[PDB]
Amino acid sequence: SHMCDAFVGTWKLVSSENFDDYMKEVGVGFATRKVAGMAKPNMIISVNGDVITIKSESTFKNTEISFILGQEFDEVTADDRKVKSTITLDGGVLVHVQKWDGKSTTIKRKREDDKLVVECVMKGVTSTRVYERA
Numbered sequence: 001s002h003m004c005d006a007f008v009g010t011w012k013l014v015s016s017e018n019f020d021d022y023m024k025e026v027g028v029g030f031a032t033r034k035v036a037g038m039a040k041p042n043m044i045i046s047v048n049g050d051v052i053t054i055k056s057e058s059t060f061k062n063t064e065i066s067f068i069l070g071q072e073f074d075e076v077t078a079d080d081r082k083v084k085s086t087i088t089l090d091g092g093v094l095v096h097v098q099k100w101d102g103k104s105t106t107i108k109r110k111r112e113d114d115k116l117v118v119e120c121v122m123k124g125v126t127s128t129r130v131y132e133r134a
């Protein structure tokens with residue numbers, strides 16, 4: 001078994017702060033921001049050996065990434081950016097960096113009490129999204 005153990009499960013969005021502003025800073029257009037911002041996704045995290053899979057299921061888009069910690073991969077984001085992503089496990093936090101067009105955003109996923117707290121940062125703008133077990 002593993003420490004990445006505390007992330008496995010089906011996590012439903014329960015609260016969001018500043019996500020519209022984060023998306024604006026990322027470069028997401030009006031209509032996509034509106035529709036994406038409405039969604040209440042489930043974030044489904046599973047582990048099989050060294051491979052971690054994170055699925056996002058929602059009324060807007062269903063997305064999935066599978067990766068090995070520390071090993072860069074291709075990701076197409078829900079807003080259709082083509083990004084180069086690397087995910088590491090640092091001090092018990094999953095740290096996800098996306099690079100594209102000379103830009104960068106960092107997404108951290110942390111267990112706090114019975115929640116999964118996700119912090120997304122694009123320059124000075126941070127959004128916090130809180131998820132609970134489904």
Ligand SMILES: O=c1[nH]nc(-c2c(N3CCCCC3)nc3ccc(Cl)cc3c2-c2ccccc2)o1
Binds near residue numbers: 023032033037058
């Ligand atoms: O699992 C989920 N919850 N939220 C997302 C998520 C996201 N996340 C946040 C959680 C951590 C990984 C990054 N970044 C986005 C960036 C641009 C756009 Cl237009 C949408 C998203 C979305 C997204 C939102 C609503 C419906 C589907 C997807 O992915």
